[PDB]
Amino acid sequence: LVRIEHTIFSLPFAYVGALLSRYPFTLADAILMAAAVVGLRMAGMAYNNIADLDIDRLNPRTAKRPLVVGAVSLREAWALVAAGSAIYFASAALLNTYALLLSPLVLAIALTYPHAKRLHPLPHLHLGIVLGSVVFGGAVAASGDEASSLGEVLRSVPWLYVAAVSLWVAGFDTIYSIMDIDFDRSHGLGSIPALLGPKGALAASLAMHAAAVALFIAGVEAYGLGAIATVSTALTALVIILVQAMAWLGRVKESFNLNLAVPIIIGAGIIVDML
The domain 157-275 is placed in CATH, from the list 1.20.120.1780, 2.40.128.630, 1.10.760.10, 1.10.540.10, at 1.20.120.1780
Q: For the chain, what is the total number of helices (H) and then of strands (E)?
A: 14, 0
User: What amino acid occupies position 83?
Assistant: A
Instruction: Write out the E strands in 21-106.
Output: none
Query: What is the sign of the dihedral through the CA atoms of 39, 118, 192 and 106?
Result: negative
For the chain, the structural domain boundaries read 1-156, 157-275
The domain 1-156 is placed in CATH, from the list 1.10.510.10, 3.40.50.300, 1.10.357.140, 3.40.50.150, at 1.10.357.140
Cβ distance 205 to 255 under 8 Å?
Answer: no
Tell me the technique behind this structure.
X-ray
145 in a known ligand binding site: no
Q: Which residues of 13-37 are buried (b: 16+ CB within 10 A; e: fewer)?
A: bbbbbbbbbebebeeebbebbbbbb
What region, left, alpha or beta, does residue 186 occupy, with left being phi > 0 and alpha being psi -120 to 50 degrees? left
Cβ distance 11 to 91 under 8 Å?
Answer: no
Residue 210: enclosing H or E segment and its boundaries? helix 198-222
Q: Which residues contact 197 (CB under 8 A, 6 or more apart)?
A: 181
